[PDB]
Structure 1
């Protein structure tokens, strides 16, 4: 019943700006073209928004993902019709796989032209249907606030993900002539006591456990307070904490209770603790088979405790669909994990010590460290050594440090051998494995966190996918530190450019390490450099 006149007389472009403001957006990634011009002009022209221009729309999409991962905010993308929109399909699929909030706005031909094979009429809502949580084509300027608010709500709730909103040029150019319902303009906005019952039962089961383990994944990062309540629970009940690859950083790996990463490529200690726990407390993690291995062989002591009525598996999971999908759980706590951890906390018995359990874990840490063939006199440099050394150099700067990667062996070496300390600092394409992610993601993370040291630990073939964005980093004023672990040089051979001459052509400093004795000094020079810088290290082949 309640009508709002406050947008009447505005174009859809100005209405778009105001809705961005209401959604607390101040950063947009994208690339102009005719169909999106009414919105692009409004956003370009307003000093309230930092518009970040890549050389390719794929770059905008991965920048938006890096921005979202680093800030906790949705990444907003603005591109034109036709090839502007089809060029952001890979980053939508990437955000869809990794549960990253992203709102994609695509210019479209006028509503009258739809279904006429017009120039750059793509069926973008058809194309993106399977790689978005939801998408829509806006049909009138009256509907623009509604759809925008709908889009942000969906992108950032449940398991976060990408949404796409298709914007016909006649709709965004139009002037709003009619009042619209006030609700549509305002950012939106028995099951309960089943959830409270499950919180109570989870607390009971945790209070009972002698050898619990917290198994933590990306979902803990989807609330600002997740890492803090995770740490509070781990201290309160003296529970060791292992993370998935996408949970790295959610728990300080220097904490005595850290087990580090679980899984096929994880810490043996993390895996042994999980195999021996009487209780697994799974928080925002999906039981991927790279983490569990053969699921029938997974957590036998927890399964035995369940069979005996004294432990098992608790799962804090926001999507009903993901509950009891892979493993049968004794207790599922449905909903946002941070929220539910906070409701549970007062019911947890404070435990002074678990001396035997931590003595066993620490014995394991001694018996089974990560191992790899280290350098010898005259040998080529090992990428694992670069990463270990760089982790220390970076940490010693005293700065907040964010790490992105490409896709390949270096991605796993980064996960394993970096020392993770802070949340929202490991930004890697895990669910889709998109080569080329590392550089634009670092540029977006740097925009999100302009004071942070932002390092891309990249591989040569990955880096080649999207290296045109080097000039974008210079233009955006993002002094990203690009590390190329170059293990190249029948089989497949790719010709690399000269990366140092490339970086200089693009407007940034370029450095190279060829032998062991140069590495320490060059790594220090690399992180100390004021602007953007590319360091190539020639490493051994696997």
Structure 2
């Protein structure tokens, strides 16, 4: 028996659990799109924007493991680029598949629509090359499947965007259906014995001489299939554990040895004192390490630190290529037992005290809210916070045990969260329908990717959208141009947005005073993901969380 390349792709995707595809129909991808509808349990998001789709695909990847978006030749693929760049930058596995024109034996003299007009049809591919781990422009079905498998394996394995160009005339050719019986190998090859070894010797050597160690969970410790290894390291050692604004969400904040969020100079004096006073640092999932001109001053001089990355090791200045943090962390876990035996637990910074009762009419303030949010969250919630005050605000909330956070800290492209809510809420519906997805986004950013709420309504998703109305680009005004016109926006009837896009079963709320917040977030019918909800929080123009108003002065 045979199966058409078009159907084989989706089949493979279903096998790797990417049950939702993102994008918009168009040139050279219409026939390919018929196929997805042929595979059981596959659905087509039906986005309203190649960008929003690229964003959604990122949120989906972050939650489900990896994702896939299909755009059209030229006009489609170029629109999604920024969303691709972001996924390339923050290590997100996204398979970008574009429907390419038919592959002919002679000059495609007649191809013009959606082209630069200069005859060069490889330009859009060459462009995506810069923000892609690898690219594959298929030409003969003799190995098309092997090539699909490869782009899928590479994406998942290395968690970075992969470009897959597929000519239209091939989506309908047949390939051996048999090929589908051997799953794709999604495993990493074991490390070079002699190096992983060397790496260990050294780390124990370091752990032994160290007197005040501290663990630091970072960006790449969340979606790199290394959650266990990390929970084990914390237990077996019992050293003080801290997260980075990018690592927040990947560590159980209700753990007895959790110190907090290390954001350098924006850290809590106690938190800052702890991390900097350590004589050894075990940074898991390393990717940030230094930030000077922007955000904070978290950079120092790398004082004797070990950096576990997905593919390499970094002890001081020496680098060990190929040595993958997973299998290392494992081999390093067996021997960590003895060397830590007589360790004296170093006191860890206490939790921030909850806000103490205040009259129900006091107007809402960000600092109060980011600290109050901790009471609404519940185990299992996926929280998403947009660049700007929100991004900063979420770093000051104590996460109930087991909560996934999404903050595009390194790339920082506003708008991105709207798309992500769809992709995330999507995956979430797929894993556990009772998993909630809360989103905090400022008024300024909603405008850039606003129409994506339409796609939320059409699928009957039930996410919580908190909109922060501080009338403008506060975060900007704080670093420059407080009253700058380019920092102000057009006023929008935020709430009515839902029904405008067709929301038939929704709820809209407007919180202005502490009282109003508690009553709502405490309602038992509100705590339940029964339907889409837009909650508009009214906040001051120059009100901002503490951590931000501090770096706002120097940067």
- How far does the alpha carbon of each residue in 1:22-58 deviate from its partner, in whole angstroms, 9 at most, with x for none? 4443222222113111221100343331322221122
2:32 maps to which residue? 39
- Separation in 2 of the partners of 1:531 and 1:192? 53
- Separation in 1 of the partners of 2:16 and 2:529? 36
Residue among 179, 182, 187 paired with 2:184: 187
- Separation in 2 of the partners of 1:185 and 1:448? 25
Conserved in 1, the CA contact under 8 Å of 2:441 and 2:468?
A: yes
1:293 maps to which residue? 297
Q: CA deviation at 1:186?
A: 5.9
2:162 maps to which residue? 163
In the superposition, relative to structure 1, how do residues 342 and 442 fare at CA in structure 2: closer, same or farther (>3 Å)? same
2:469 maps to which residue? 486
Aligned-pair RMSD on alpha carbons? 3.1
- Separation in 2 of the partners of 1:418 and 1:436? 25
Residue among 304, 319, 323 paired with 1:335: 323
In the superposition, relative to structure 1, how do residues 370 and 171 fare at CA in structure 2: closer, same or farther (>3 Å)? farther
Greater CA drift, 198-207 or 27-36: 198-207
Residue among 94, 100, 103 paired with 2:92: 100
Residue among 399, 409, 415 paired with 1:430: 409
- How far does the alpha carbon of each residue in 1:171-225 deviate from its partner, in whole angstroms, 9 at most, with x for none? 213345xx7997998624794311122123213322443211112212222333x
1:306 maps to which residue? none
Q: CA deviation at 1:370?
A: 9.7
1:255-334 matches, cutoff 5 A: 255-264=255-264, 265-290=266-291, 293=297, 295=299, 297-298=300-301, 303=303, 312-320=304-312, 323=314, 328-329=316-317
- How far does the alpha carbon of each residue in 1:395-443 deviate from its partner, in whole angstroms, 9 at most, with x for none? 2xxx5100112211211111232526326x1112122111112122122
Q: CA deviation at 1:476?
A: 1.9
1:309 maps to which residue? none
TM-score (norm 2): 0.82
Conserved in 2, the CA contact under 8 Å of 1:216 and 1:282?
A: yes
1:128 is aligned to 2:128: yes
2:498 maps to which residue? 503
Task: Structure 1: state its 5+ residue gaps.
Answer: 1-5, 304-311
- Separation in 2 of the partners of 1:460 and 1:77? 27
1:403 maps to which residue? 383
1:14 is aligned to 2:7: yes
Residue among 34, 44, 49 paired with 1:51: 44
2:452 maps to which residue? 469
Q: CA deviation at 1:315?
A: 2.0
SS in 1 for 2:142: helix
SS in 1 for 2:256: coil
1:536 maps to which residue? 536
- Separation in 1 of the partners of 2:342 and 2:443? 47
1:346-385 matches, cutoff 5 A: 346-349=334-337, 351=340, 354-355=343-344, 357-358=346-347, 361-362=348-349, 365=350, 380-385=363-368
Conserved in 1, the CA contact under 8 Å of 2:5 and 2:172?
A: yes
1:251 is aligned to 2:243: no
| Larger helix share, 1 or 2 | 1
1:205 is aligned to 2:198: no
SS in 2 for 1:446: helix
- Separation in 2 of the partners of 1:275 and 1:482? 37
- Separation in 2 of the partners of 1:370 and 1:167? 56
1:223 maps to which residue? 224
- Separation in 1 of the partners of 2:414 and 2:141? 38
- Separation in 1 of the partners of 2:180 and 2:488? 58
SS in 2 for 1:357: coil
Conserved in 2, the CA contact under 8 Å of 1:313 and 1:329?
A: no
Q: Which runs of 4+ in 1 moved over 4 A?
A: 113-117, 179-186, 329-334, 350-356, 369-372, 374-379
1:26 maps to which residue? 19
Residue among 88, 91, 99 paired with 2:83: 91
- Separation in 2 of the partners of 1:239 and 1:294? 21
1:391 is aligned to 2:370: no
- Separation in 1 of the partners of 2:521 and 2:346? 39
- Separation in 1 of the partners of 2:335 and 2:109? 59
In the superposition, relative to structure 1, how do residues 335 and 271 fare at CA in structure 2: closer, same or farther (>3 Å)? farther
SS in 1 for 2:28: helix
SS in 1 for 2:222: helix
Task: Structure 2: state its 5+ residue gaps.
Answer: 116-120, 473-482, 543-555
- Separation in 1 of the partners of 2:142 and 2:451? 39
- Separation in 1 of the partners of 2:46 and 2:227? 33
